[PDB]
Amino acid sequence: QFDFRASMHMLTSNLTFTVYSDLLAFVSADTVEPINAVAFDNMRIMNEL
Amino acid sequence: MDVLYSLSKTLKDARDKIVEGTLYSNVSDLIQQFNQMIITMNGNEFQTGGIGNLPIRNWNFDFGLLGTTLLNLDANYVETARNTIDYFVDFVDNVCMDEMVRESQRNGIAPQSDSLRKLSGIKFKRINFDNSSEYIENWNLQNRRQRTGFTFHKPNIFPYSASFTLNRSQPAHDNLMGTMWLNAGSEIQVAGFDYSCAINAPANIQQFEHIVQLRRVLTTATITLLPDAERFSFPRVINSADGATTWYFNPVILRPNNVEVEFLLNGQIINTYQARFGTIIARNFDTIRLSFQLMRPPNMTPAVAALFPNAQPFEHHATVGLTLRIESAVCESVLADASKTMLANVTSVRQEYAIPVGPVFPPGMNWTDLITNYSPSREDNLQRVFTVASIRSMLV
């Protein structure tokens, strides 16, 4: 049988939000000139120049 | 005061009515009043001060309102309401205690603590709702200069006094005539003693009078009058008036003669009871006059005649008595009484936090000292603290 007391609930959620998928779209990424690029040892990758 | 009482009453109603399973319709108006109180008190900072050993406490109010969401209240709703109610009850109890421990000579009826003075602001008047208790109703009517009274069972209207008056005395204290009396709370036990049993009296009649001036006017009083005073009907050794020596009392009780109890107001004869014992009604009075006679029995059996010789020594002393018990009364001023707990509450709060003796009340809130010198300022302060105590009693 349908019982109103047993069926009445309060559903709770957030009022609103925006879900984002591409996190890296939020990052402005630039790179140094290739001439100046350095390796892990802080020296230039290609030193013959 | 009315805002503090309204806070206390709202919290009491919330605690009593917001219960698991109760219909939404049993609390709708209560929920509205509670939310109004929450809105009014939210965002306010209160400080209950540090008079005596009472700790300084800071109160902040940021509480969410109570929803109207379930047809029958559930455990979650009651839990949230209980959290809010517990914090508010703690705040109210501390404010009441802080107010109880203060007094002022000039404006004794006005709030004294910072918390209650702040609650007297206009912004908090919205919290006010039904003021139905006896003490708050009397507070409001008195503020409006309207006639109103407190009903007391066994009112504590007589300061403690156990003393005597010797109308006839000697250094040897062997032929004495006078009166003893105990006035304690609602009881007046008086006795008149003649050692000679009125052998030399003008008509073998000795007249005794006891006058008690009440510190406040009592109205609609029911009183029990009994012929004998059992407190002064056994042998006693009594220190002299100045304490120099002691004298002996050996009462033999005789029937009081020509008893007259007069209840006087403004010096006028309001009520008069002649040879009437049992329950009597005093309409409205401020003085009691008990006039009674010791009549030497004209006819005595040989034993009775042996009790009272024609001359000294007098080893049996003829005593008449009277007991007057104010069982209930009505008074425009607050008083201590058996049934209520306001004096006990105020005194306990002041003792438990070692409140230094103020400029109004006697040390230790001694009720005998308070009533003995029941000044208008003391009356105002006592009404204030008693009303605060009655407010506190609803939650504590």
Place this chain on the structure above:
Amino acid sequence: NSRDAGKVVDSETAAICDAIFQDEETEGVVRRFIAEMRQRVQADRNVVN
């Protein structure tokens, strides 16, 4: 049937509530509750019930 600008989730709940409200065997208490049950939107908290 709301007397206080009430809202419900979802449209099926609205249909059920209207059917119960118009029903003659419904309790008076249930009818009044349907007329008075309210949502709570707390935008500052970002919550909706």
